[PDB]
Amino acid sequence: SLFAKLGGREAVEAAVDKFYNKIVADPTVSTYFSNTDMKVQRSKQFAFLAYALGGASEWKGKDMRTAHKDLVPHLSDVHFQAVARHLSDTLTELGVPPEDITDAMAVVASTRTEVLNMPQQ
Numbered sequence: 001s002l003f004a005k006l007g008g009r010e011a012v013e014a015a016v017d018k019f020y021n022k023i024v025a026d027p028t029v030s031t032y033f034s035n036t037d038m039k040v041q042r043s044k045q046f047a048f049l050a051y052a053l054g055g056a057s058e059w060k061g062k063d064m065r066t067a068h069k070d071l072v073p074h075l076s077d078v079h080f081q082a083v084a085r086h087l088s089d090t091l092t093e094l095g096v097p098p099e100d101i102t103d104a105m106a107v108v109a110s111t112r113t114e115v116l117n118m119p120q121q
């Protein structure tokens, strides 16, 4: 599984932690999290990614569209690209092989339509 190739639990915990340190230091997206407990957020993101990367059987939290559709200003590709960039940079900083980063980013890309609450075509 991509989850295992990445290093499993320890690796994903490390990635999520570094990821959110970048998120809160980036004015392009940090205000969205001003009323969020970032330890709880780290917990939920790990659980979602474990599922999305093939390390967990299911995800029982909010579906991605419900989770973001009501955030304001409405999310755009500027925000999506900012978050994707932070996750990619985190994996690079953690020494993940570029080919594994590519696979992880494809998983992230697959969430775009729902995360951005866009017409499903």
Ligand code: HEM
Pocket (backbone or CB within 6 Å): 028, 029, 030, 032, 033, 035, 036, 037, 044, 045, 048, 061, 062, 063, 067, 068, 071, 075, 079, 080, 083, 084, 108, 111, 115
């Ligand atoms: C890159 C793709 C993204 C993924 C996979 C993702 C995933 C998630 C997940 C799993 C949750 C938790 C949902 C729950 O409560 O069950 C969440 C919450 C949230 N996300 Fe994202 N997200 C993404 C992008 C973004 C972007 C671009 C923003 C805006 C800058 C954003 C803002 C938020 C906020 C504000 C919350 C909830 C905060 C709270 O409940 O306190 N997310 N996201």
Ligand SMILES: [C-]#N
Pocket (backbone or CB within 6 Å): 041, 045
């Ligand atoms: C997204 N947190």
